[PDB]
PDB file of N, CA and C in Angstrom:
ATOM      1  N   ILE A   1      93.188 119.414  91.452  1.00 29.34           N
ATOM      2  CA  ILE A   1      92.000 118.446  92.015  1.00 29.34           C
ATOM      3  C   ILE A   1      93.309 117.233  92.861  1.00 29.34           C
ATOM      4  N   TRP A   2      93.252 116.861  93.681  1.00 28.20           N
ATOM      5  CA  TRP A   2      93.125 115.531  94.430  1.00 28.20           C
ATOM      6  C   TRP A   2      93.245 115.603  96.081  1.00 28.20           C
ATOM      7  N   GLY A   3      93.612 114.477  96.187  1.00 28.54           N
ATOM      8  CA  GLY A   3      92.892 113.881  98.025  1.00 28.54           C
ATOM      9  C   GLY A   3      94.901 113.149  98.305  1.00 28.54           C
ATOM     10  N   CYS A   4      95.373 112.268  98.724  1.00 30.59           N
ATOM     11  CA  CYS A   4      97.024 111.306  97.317  1.00 30.59           C
ATOM     12  C   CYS A   4      99.319 110.965  97.803  1.00 30.59           C
ATOM     13  N   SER A   5      99.291 109.793  97.493  1.00 33.85           N
ATOM     14  CA  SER A   5     100.973 110.084  97.150  1.00 33.85           C
ATOM     15  C   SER A   5     101.136 110.317  95.825  1.00 33.85           C
ATOM     16  N   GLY A   6     101.454 112.332  96.135  1.00 36.19           N
ATOM     17  CA  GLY A   6     102.050 113.484  95.324  1.00 36.19           C
ATOM     18  C   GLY A   6     101.351 114.726  95.220  1.00 36.19           C
ATOM     19  N   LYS A   7      99.947 114.611  96.218  1.00 34.73           N
ATOM     20  CA  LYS A   7      99.638 116.161  96.118  1.00 34.73           C
ATOM     21  C   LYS A   7      99.733 115.693  98.044  1.00 34.73           C
ATOM     22  N   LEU A   8      99.491 115.201  99.033  1.00 34.61           N
ATOM     23  CA  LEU A   8      99.428 115.318  99.938  1.00 34.61           C
ATOM     24  C   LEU A   8      99.187 113.772 100.892  1.00 34.61           C
ATOM     25  N   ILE A   9     100.123 113.166 101.306  1.00 35.55           N
ATOM     26  CA  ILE A   9     100.415 112.226 101.976  1.00 35.55           C
ATOM     27  C   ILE A   9      98.939 111.847 103.609  1.00 35.55           C
ATOM     28  N   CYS A  10      98.715 110.698 103.542  1.00 36.07           N
ATOM     29  CA  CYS A  10      97.646 110.025 104.223  1.00 36.07           C
ATOM     30  C   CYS A  10      98.131 109.708 105.721  1.00 36.07           C
ATOM     31  N   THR A  11      98.258 110.329 106.692  1.00 38.35           N
ATOM     32  CA  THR A  11      99.033 110.363 107.744  1.00 38.35           C
ATOM     33  C   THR A  11      98.050 109.643 109.183  1.00 38.35           C
ATOM     34  N   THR A  12      98.372 108.118 108.821  1.00 37.49           N
ATOM     35  CA  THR A  12      97.150 107.430 109.618  1.00 37.49           C
ATOM     36  C   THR A  12      98.621 106.298 110.533  1.00 37.49           C
ATOM     37  N   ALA A  13      98.245 106.833 111.577  1.00 37.52           N
ATOM     38  CA  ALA A  13      99.487 105.864 112.590  1.00 37.52           C
ATOM     39  C   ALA A  13      98.908 104.709 113.540  1.00 37.52           C
TER      40      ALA A  13
END
């Protein structure tokens, strides 16, 4: 149970 650099990176351009 993670949001992350590890689970799935937060794509924000």
